[PDB]
């Protein structure tokens, strides 16, 4: 009685565009073109698709299928599958927090740019500002100029000394205090996600209509814009030039696997939650297939969108676009690309729609990111929760604000890297691995094929079967081992991170993982009988 069954989506297209919205983000824009043009160029398409087909798609569709079939949260679904792995649902909840600490600060940067783009003359064009040094050298200025090791561009100066104010910190050691502007920006962000998540899937499914469609429009405008630019063929050349020898490197495949995984992000419970609020009769196979093909093709065209403008930028300078594309990260979009669109007619337009496009990319992904955790806790603590949703949503959101307060600092950018590389990545792969292994081996892939057979009416192919049994956990296992084996020395803005950073990172990497073996210990410690009896009843799901 009472509430009972959960709510459903208002329309198919709403959740289709919703999962597409989650799938597509910043990384799709700048990450893939960089890792692509760096690793054998266009040839990078060959393993990337493979790592998709054999790796990404099966995890994606498995996650989605479990989601639509069981209609449970990230924590409650393990109660009815493998109780011992219930801690998985908790782990993600911590992970997301770590993700939500830096992810929205980037959008806060893009927002500071967005509000700083309303002026007729854009700030990062001139050097006559309050933050520029004597090194600031800009164009429409005396020619014959010769760049110096210490010299700095007005865009690099703007991004460095103003929106980041990273010069006010010596590193991870001393990074305080806080830039209140980015605090107001990220506050506005937490507000615009607050009013887009608090009611649930009904509102999110409608905000996504804008947040998931506009980026393609902006990419089209910057696409036709970058295409009409002189000497733009250099960036495309450097972008799709086949270097098959690079395919001999055992690394590239890893980059491709990691890329497709972390741009599809399966087994994170968000797709699970988005699938939870859907029709049982409704198909999800076609959904997953197409949806993925979107995050991917979208990445492919995004490559052109970036490297056309990078090509023109390499044309106004002196070629080897790689040089203008050395640094990968926020500097590629916030400095190089911004300085690039600055030297174009009606630059205010392309700037506004550009940074607006960035925010628009981060927004939906963030929506879904929180949405998964919220759904998980609500389904895990029903009645105990739902008195109001805006209460718990407010709690987790302001919690994310306090979590981002460490990131809103001067050296905050540093932390952004430290959290993006060290903390999140290995663990999610880990929890995705444990999840896949638990669904394919513990729950039995046979009964899973029976569930799909009851879902769509037919048992899933032997391809998906062998992918779930072997190929996908090997896919995650590959990236896990390759990651652990070679933790990365990481650097940002002429500043090498301290040797101990990784230690710190590992802390942030393990502080989320500690919950599942201790939950296994809690279960096996609480469950009476013998190890085989309690572990046999702990391997066997809920009877009711």
């Amino acid at each position, epitope marked *: 009685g009472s509430q009972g069954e959960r709510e459903t989506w208002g329309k198919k297209v709403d959740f289709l565009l919703s999962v597409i919205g989650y799938a597509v983000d910043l990384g799709n824009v700048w990450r893939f073109p960089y890792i692509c043009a760096q690793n054998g160029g266009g040839a990078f398409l060959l393993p990337y698709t493979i790592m998709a087909i054999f790796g990404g798609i099966p995890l994606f569709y498995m996650e989605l299928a479990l989601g639509q079939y069981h209609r449970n949260g990230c924590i409650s679904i393990w109660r009815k599958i493998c109780p011992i792995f219930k801690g998985i649902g908790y782990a993600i909840c911590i992970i997301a927090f770590y993700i939500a600490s830096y992810y929205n600060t980037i959008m806060a940067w893009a927002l500071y740019y967005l509000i700083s783009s309303f002026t007729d003359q854009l700030p990062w064009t001139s050097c006559k500002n309050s933050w520029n040094t004597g090194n600031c050298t800009n164009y429409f200025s005396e020619d014959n100029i010769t*760049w110096t*090791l210490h010299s700095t561009s007005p865009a690099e100066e703007f991004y460095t000394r103003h929106v980041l104010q990273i010069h006010r910190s010596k590193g991870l050691q001393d990074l305080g205090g806080i830039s209140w502007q980015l605090a107001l920006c990220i506050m506005l962000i937490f507000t615009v996600i607050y009013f887009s998540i608090w009611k649930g899937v009904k509102t999110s499914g409608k905000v996504v209509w804008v947040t998931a469609t506009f980026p393609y429009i902006a990419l089209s405008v910057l696409l036709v814009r970058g295409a009409t630019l002189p000497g733009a063929w250099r960036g495309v050349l450097f972008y799709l030039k086949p270097n098959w020898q690079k395919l001999l490197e055992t690394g590239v495949w890893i980059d491709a696997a990691a890329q497709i995984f972390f741009s599809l992000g399966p087994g994170f419970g968000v797709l699970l939650a988005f699938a939870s609020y859907n029709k049982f009769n409704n198909n999800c196979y076609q959904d997953a297939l197409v949806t993925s093909v979107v995050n991917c093709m979208t990445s492919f065209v995004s490559g052109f969108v970036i490297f056309t403008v990078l090509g023109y930028m390499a044309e106004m300078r*002196n070629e080897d676009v790689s040089e203008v594309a050395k640094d990968a990260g926020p500097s590629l979009l916030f400095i190089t690309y911004a300085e690039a669109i600055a030297n174009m007619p009606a630059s205010t337009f392309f700037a506004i729609i550009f940074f607006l496009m960035l925010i628009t990319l981060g927004l939906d992904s963030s929506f879904a990111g929180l949405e998964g955790v919220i759904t998980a806790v609500l389904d895990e603590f029903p009645h105990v929760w739902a008195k109001r949703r805006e209460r718990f949503v407010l709690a987790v959101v302001i919690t994310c604000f306090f979590g981002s307060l460490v990131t809103l600092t001067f050296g905050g950018a540093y932390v952004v890297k430290l959290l993006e590389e060290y903390a999140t990545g290995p663990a999610v792969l880990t929890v995705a691995l444990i999840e896949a292994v638990a669904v394919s081996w513990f729950y039995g892939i046979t009964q899973f094929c029976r569930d799909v057979k009851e879902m769509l009416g037919f048992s899933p192919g032997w391809f998906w079967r062998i992918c779930w049994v072997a190929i996908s956990p090997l896919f995650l296992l590959f990236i896990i081992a390759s990651f652990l084996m070679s933790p990365p020395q990481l650097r940002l803005f002429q500043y090498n991170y301290p040797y101990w950073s990784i230690i710190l990172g590992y802390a942030i990497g393990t502080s989320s993982f500690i919950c599942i073996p201790t939950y296994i210990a809690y279960r096996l410690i609480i469950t009476p009988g013998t190890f085989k009896e309690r572990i046999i009843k702990s391997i066997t799901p809920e009877t009711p």
Partner: antibody
Amino acid sequence: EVQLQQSGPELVKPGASVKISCKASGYTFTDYYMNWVKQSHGKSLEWIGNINPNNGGTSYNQKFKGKATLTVDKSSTTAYMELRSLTSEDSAVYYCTRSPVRPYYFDYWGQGTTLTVSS
Amino acid sequence: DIVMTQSHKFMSTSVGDRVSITCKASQDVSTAVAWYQQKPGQSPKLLIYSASYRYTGVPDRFTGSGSGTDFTFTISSVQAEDLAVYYCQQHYSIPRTFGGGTKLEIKR
């Protein structure tokens, strides 16, 4: 004005090592990349690699990777190049030349260093 | 990598005549070519940078042209002291490579 005074000629036996200095003067030493160019007898110029005086930012050539080692000293504003596993091909004239970051031309060169690898 | 090719190893000219040295690159270079003048027994001296621009201390009789792959170094009034070996060099892609070198022999 701007002068790059290198070290004198060196006669060294094969299999050994050899180090060449480069006292830079007449400009801000930390404001420019320091490069090294190899020139064989009757052959063309050959770029070995550069170095950033600030942090010792060495950028070598794939043809010279593990063949040459560039170092730098700010306390005396002097760049060094060390060569190991010396052969008859290394018997060439070497220059240390200043260069900006962009555009990457070699404005000022050293007087040169004659290296002879023979027993 | 990039191959800077000077097809003519030797070029004959006279004092006062108009001489022009060619330079062929592997791919498109836009306008990123520098011309150097190395007199016998001296270090290479920078004359031209960025295809057409002259460096400071370089006489007006030295000019540069070309945009793309083929580039040209021009001297209108050849002097007796202009006897040297001229090199062309690209400055965009790592590593920086040089031309084979065109020795300018004077005819009298």
